[PDB]
């Protein structure tokens, strides 16, 4: 139709269709879950392999010693945004000699990604981000969207089939805050597993875990460092 | 070509129709009436008066902020008709142009010069395709030392002109015919007669008896060239004098 090609065209219903299509771009990606306790923020990303002979695509990126992200949607847009966030964190450490507070970084992201939603010939970023951070206010989980809106969350899941993960997180959100690190990671892993097909199970090949905490700088566990977190997982309840 | 002929994008951008018309400019003239208000300006022998319709439907609206009367300089006043935000942008541009003219040339801008400047700026919108013309009309009043009171009107087409009397808005055709009748039977217009003529024109074309809160009045006189907006007391005095006659 005539209203669904340009990001500068309002539809007669008060919507912008290009922004919703970028939202669909985020929904096409593989699932990822983020949750926080009193002291830790955990991202667990289900990685997807294009072929049987390919490595699983990286989903968790370093931003700074206290901030990491997991991505859904267009990977190159995610790399653009990650470079921007890294530059902001380095600017903060250069000027103020302090780590940039997470919510200020998320505000900068929202400001940067709102601009192309109003200018002709631009497009929205087609990437959704889960941002795990730790600062003076404790742990933080943030969700950023192609619409440039962002949410402070107790827990969140984005990507394909993320509604099941969101239901599980709804169920155990009351438990999350008093969990220790291993229990929190296991909650995230169960939520991520709820988005899997029946045949597929969580393995050290398709699971990536990012953790940040009070005394713990942001760390990524990919293949063999994931096994201690996978050990002890009960079989899928079905 | 044929009457009301169209070809290409002549109904969407400011390019010529086969008859040589600019449809977007005509649509902007209709945008003026979209506002739903009417204003009248009348030139006396020693004064110029602008009277605009003031409508405040709801009591939640702070009435003191609902004005179509603005002062551009100390001595130049204006009434705007049409789209409110376009009107306010044009008012800001006029204030800037006046201040800059004073700064560069060392004397206050004449009313005709300010009207011509605004008209040039809007002709630019009539000739460039990437922006729409403003949907507003500006009426300026002032006192020139050489020529007396001045009433000038500029429109979205970039056309401007000086007037003995003029009107803008929904009922401006009826207002113009009424003012034609009043100016044909020319008699010496004092300040009171000019104000009464403007108010009676608005009241007769809107077919309502007015109240001091329903209209807004601004004046410039030779005795006091400074532009001043009449308070509700002065307007009510004028309205009483008009009602008794």
């Amino acid at each position: 139709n005539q209203y669904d090609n340009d990001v500068t065209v309002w539809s007669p219903q008060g919507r912008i269709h290009q922004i919703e299509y970028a939202m669909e771009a985020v929904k096409q990606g593989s699932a990822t879950v983020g949750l926080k306790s009193k002291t830790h923020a955990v991202l667990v990303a289900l990685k997807r392999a294009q072929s049987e002979l390919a490595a699983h695509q990286k989903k968790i990126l370093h931003v700074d010693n206290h901030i990491g992200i997991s991505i859904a949607g267009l990977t190159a847009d995610a790399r653009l945004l990650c470079n921007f966030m890294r530059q902001e964190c380095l600017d903060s450490r250069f000027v103020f000699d302090r780590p940039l507070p997470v919510s200020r970084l998320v505000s900068l992201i929202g400001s940067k990604t709102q601009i192309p939603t109003q200018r002709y010939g631009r497009r929205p970023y087609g990437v959704g981000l889960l941002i795990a951070g730790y600062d003076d206010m404790g742990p933080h989980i943030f969700q950023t969207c192609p619409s440039a809106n962002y949410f402070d969350c107790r827990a969140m899941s984005i990507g394909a089939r993320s509604q099941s993960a969101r239901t599980y997180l709804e169920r155990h959100m009351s438990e999350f805050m008093e969990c220790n690190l291993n229990e929190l990671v296991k909650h995230g892993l169960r939520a991520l597993r709820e988005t899997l097909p029946a045949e597929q199970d969580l393995t050290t090949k398709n699971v990536s875990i990012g953790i940040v905490g009070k005394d713990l700088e942001f760390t990524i566990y990919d293949d063999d460092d994931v096994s201690p977190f996978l050990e002890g997982l009960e079989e899928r309840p079905q | 070509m044929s009457r009301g002929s169209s070809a290409g994008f002549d109904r969407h951008i400011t390019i010529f129709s086969p008859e040589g018309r600019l449809y977007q400019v005509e649509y902007a003239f209709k945008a003026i009436n979209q506002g739903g208000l009417t204003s009248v300006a009348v030139r006396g022998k020693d004064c110029a008066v602008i009277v605009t319709q003031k409508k405040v439907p709801d009591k939640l609206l702070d009435s003191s902020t609902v004005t179509h009367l603005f002062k551009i300089t100390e001595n130049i006043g204006c009434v705007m008709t049409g789209m409110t935000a376009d009107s306010r942008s044009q008012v800001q541009r006029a204030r800037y142009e006046a201040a800059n003219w004073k700064y560069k040339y060392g004397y206050e801008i004449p009313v005709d010069m300010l009207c011509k400047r605004i008209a040039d700026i809007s002709q630019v919108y009539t000739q460039n395709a990437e922006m729409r013309p403003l949907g507003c009309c500006m009426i300026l009043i002032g006192i020139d030392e050489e020529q007396g009171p001045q009433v000038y009107k500029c429109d979205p087409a970039g056309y401007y002109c000086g007037f003995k009397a003029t009107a803008a808005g929904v009922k401006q055709t009826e207002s113009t015919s009424f003012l034609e009748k009043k100016v044909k039977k020319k008699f010496d217009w004092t300040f009171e007669q000019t104000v009464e003529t403007a108010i009676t024109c608005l009241s007769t074309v809107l077919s309502i008896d007015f109240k001091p809160s329903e209209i807004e009045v601004g004046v410039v006189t030779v005795e006091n060239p400074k532009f001043r907006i009449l308070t509700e007391a002065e307007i009510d005095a004028h309205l009483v004098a008009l009602a008794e006659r």
């Binding site: - | 002062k71 551009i72 300089t73 800001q92 204030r95 800037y96 201040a99 800059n100 004073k102 700064y103």
Partner: protein
């Protein structure tokens, strides 16, 4: 050049000499150094005539546009801030010492000094220019709190006369301006109207 401004309860008094020199030549002996910035706001100017004239014109323009936009009489502090911004931004290119004095409904009578370099300070009274060095002791010994408009006018006239008698860069006539809520009253002291102080002989 000697410029001076004094605050009293309901307004200010400004005063200046009228001498503009080029070296030892007096190029203008009746210079008007008291410049209206707005209806109740004046500036006294010292330093380069081109610089102060340009800056005063620019500030007049900005303050007038700002006052039209706000539909409010300008604050003396706002004019002083505009002068300060201009003088600080171009401190390497300008030689301008300004006194900004005037009346506000919100603040009353106000005197601000914007010396060379572009700092801004409010003072009970301010002096400036090359002649001002000779009257620092006099104004320190003479000024008292609670002077009326007439006392302020006499104080300013005496100080300016003393500076004009000592400073070769000052002279001519004394231009005074009293600014209050009712308006501005300007006067020129010339000839025998200028306060006289006998030269000590023998």
């Amino acid at each position: 050049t000697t410029i001076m401004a004094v605050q009293f309860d309901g307004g200010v008094v400004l005063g200046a000499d009228s001498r503009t020199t080029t070296g030892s030549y007096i190029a203008n002996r009746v210079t008007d150094k008291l410049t209206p910035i707005h209806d109740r706001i004046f500036c006294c100017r010292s330093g380069s005539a081109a610089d102060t004239q340009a800056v005063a014109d620019a500030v007049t323009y900005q303050l007038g546009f700002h006052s039209i936009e706000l539909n409010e009489p300008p604050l003396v502090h706002t004019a002083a801030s505009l002068f300060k911004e201009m003088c600080y931004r171009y401190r390497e290119d300008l030689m301008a010492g300004i006194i900004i004095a005037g009346w506000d409904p919100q603040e009353g009578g106000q005197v601000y000094s914007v010396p060379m370099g572009g700092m801004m300070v409010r003072q009970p009274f301010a002096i400036g220019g090359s002649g001002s060095s000779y009257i620092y002791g006099y104004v320190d010994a003479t000024y008292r709190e609670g002077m009326t408009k007439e006392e302020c006018l006499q104080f300013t006239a005496n100080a300016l006369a003393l500076a004009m008698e000592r400073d070769g860069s000052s002279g001519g006539v004394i231009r005074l301006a009293a600014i209050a809520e009712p308006g501005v009253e300007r006067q020129v002291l010339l000839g025998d109207q200028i306060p006289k102080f006998t030269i000590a002989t023998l």
